[PDB]
Amino acid sequence: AKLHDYYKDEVVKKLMTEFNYNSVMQVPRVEKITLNMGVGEAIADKKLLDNAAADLAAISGQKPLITKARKSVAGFKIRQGYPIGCKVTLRGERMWEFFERLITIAVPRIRDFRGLSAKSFDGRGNYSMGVREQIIFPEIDYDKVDRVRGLDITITTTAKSDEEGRALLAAFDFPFR
Amino acid sequence: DKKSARIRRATRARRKLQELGATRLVVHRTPRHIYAQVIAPNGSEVLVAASTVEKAIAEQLKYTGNKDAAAAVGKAVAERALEKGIKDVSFDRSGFQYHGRVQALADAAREAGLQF
Amino acid sequence: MFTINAEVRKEQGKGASRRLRAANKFPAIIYGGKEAPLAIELDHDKVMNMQAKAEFYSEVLTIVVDGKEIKVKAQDVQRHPYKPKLQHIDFVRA
Amino acid sequence: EAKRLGVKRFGGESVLAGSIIVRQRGTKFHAGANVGCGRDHTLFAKADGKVKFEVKGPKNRKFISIEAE
RNA sequence: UGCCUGGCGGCCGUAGCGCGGUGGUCCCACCUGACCCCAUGCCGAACUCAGAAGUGAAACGCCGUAGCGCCGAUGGUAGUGUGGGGUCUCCCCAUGCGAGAGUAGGGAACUGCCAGGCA
RNA sequence: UCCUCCUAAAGAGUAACGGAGGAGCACGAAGGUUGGCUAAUCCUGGUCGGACAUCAGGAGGUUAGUGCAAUGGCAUAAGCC
RNA sequence: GUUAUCACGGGAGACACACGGCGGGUGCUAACGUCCGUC
């Protein structure tokens, strides 16, 4: 709400002006956000998975859900039905506030800030990257940090092309590649 | 898609009722409007039908779509079926979830004098 | 410029085909357009001599049947598996 | 032992209630009207009438039906 | 009753797939939270409540494209039931049933009932 | 002893000391009901990753799985919650 | 077509078939070797 109002006030206007769209909702509309943890070392120990899930729940407004094995391979010695990681599916006020808090401080402050990639898209305009050093986030404090860990962040949107993703990045002002 | 999933879910009871071969009352629901009909065993003829979009039954309803509207539609369908002589139809909720307007209209039809 | 001759087809079936092949002849068919397809009878040695030419692959055949001249083109020629005999030809009224 | 397989009764022939039409290893045929499928994937009649075969469905699967005389 | 939309059946690649166009008159679809109807292997994940605040946009109805794909003759060919012959590993003679494949052709399907809208 | 494909010739049955194989198991859940979901494989991004832990998106549409050797079937699922 | 069809009662015989024709399997797509379904 707090960020959605501004998004509709300014982002939609500029997007429509630049893309000469006709339908009011032709502008891209965010569907959801996904924050997943796919470290894969959960086989060695199971407590780290629970600790990371609790940390994700604390930083977000809802608890993550665990994901079971998809397909087993003899090379990596992984069975079926054994949980490895978990994901948080942010929708609504929770996703809005989480994304606002991220973009406010977290993204600017990161070591080796080379810049996000505007071309690394799945193919239909869904931006799904991975970020390490979870300490960058403000919620994760040294009193609870356990080990340098990474996560996968995706913004699922109704768009079906990379041009819409580029326009969304431009609206977010896209500091630099 | 939502309509395809709903149709596939309803297909279970739709095919199961073919073996029974008895007239069945079905209701399609939408936040805007609600439709209802009583299909014959052949599956191609309906003995009675109604729709919330129709003013003839929406005159006393504040709007076509609401719990009171669904209850009134169910009561009207039950009364019309009883006066026509449907002879103990079966029920099918078109693959919906039996907790809201569908439940209200089913209860209304049951209390109208039906035995399904 | 190429002379051709044909005979009316009045028989039908594998029996007729065997009769023709025993009598040293074989049938052919002409199809295409709105006119109904029709079967015609041709001999064997003369047809082989005609086909010996290398221009048949692009020449328009002038069939002479029942005192009528018809311009056609051969598209399919069913040839015997190994023996040097022909048993069926297909023409289109181009 | 050689397990018995095949179509016990063909189309256009009369069958009574509970009569098996075809005892198939799998489900090469599907019951239609007045035909039921047992636990052994066997099609059995439920009424008295003539048997018939038909082909339909997205995969052109075969159906066995019964029409009362 | 001319046209559009949704549901209830038939048929099951002529209804299938790719591309362009069009659509809010009705209908359909996107939307907030939900302590309340309903409940989540967390999530309103699926389904429900206030309707248009706004639109025809994923999707969805329809038209063109015969592009991919599908159905498909007559005839011919392989095969085969009966009687006989030959140089009897196989072929032919008289006769009946007839392939697959391919060509012409077909077609962007069609049909019965209910409901709403522009007339 | 039982069971699976040919032989066994477009109905069924159909043999040689013919050519090819598994079993003497197994549940108080791996059964039933009801409410739901739906496959291997490749591609994009991916400190751990070597192509081959899993992860967000696309194609695929049962070549997966369907406890055993094998055969017929299973998407409406007979596969899973 | 003389009911040439089926059903019950009593009496049987055999319970070691060869050759040829038609479509096949084993055999080395060596066969006229060998075993099958039918006349």
What domains appear along chain A, each with residue ranges and CATH number?
Answer: 1-177 (3.30.1440.10)
Reported CATH class of domain C1-94: mainly beta
Q: Would you tell me how many other CB atoms lie within 10 Å of the CB of residue D13? A: 11
CA of A87 to C1' of F25 (A): 42
Helix axes B101-111, B67-84, angle to 10 degrees: 40
Chains in contact with A via at least 3 Cβ–Cβ pairs below 8 Å: none
Nearest protein residue to nucleotide E52 (CA to C1' distance) is B32
**How many domains, in total, are found in chain B?**
1
Residue nearest to nucleotide F55 (CA to C1'): A38
The reply to whether C77 Cβ lies less than 7 angstroms from strand E is: no
How far: D53 CA to F68 C1' (Å)?
A: 36
Backbone angles phi and psi of A98, in degrees to 5: -65, -45
Segments forming the whole domain that contains residue D66: 5-69
Scanning every strand, the nucleotide with its C1' closest to A35's CA turns out to be F56
CA neighbours closer than 13 Å in the CB half-sphere of residue A43: 10
Say which amino acid occupies A62: Q
Protein-to-nucleotide distance from the CA of D43 to the C1' of E99, whole angstroms: 33
Please give the nucleotide, over all strands, whose C1' is closest to the CA of residue B42: E9
Specify the DSSP class assigned to residue A174: -
Structural domain span for residue B100: 1-116
Overall domain count for chain D: 1
CA distance C62 to B70: 79
Buried b (16+ CB within 10 A) or exposed e, B86-116: beebebbbbbbeeeebbbbbbebbeebebee
Structure tokens that stand for D66 in this block: 């019964």
Closest CA to B74 of B106, B115, B33, B32: B106
Chain E: positions less than 7 Å from a protein CB are 6-13, 26-34, 37-39, 41-52, 54-60, 73-80, 92-98, 102-104, 112-117
DSSP H stretches of helix in C2-61 = 14-22, 45-51
Query: CA C91, C1' F54: Å apart?
Result: 65
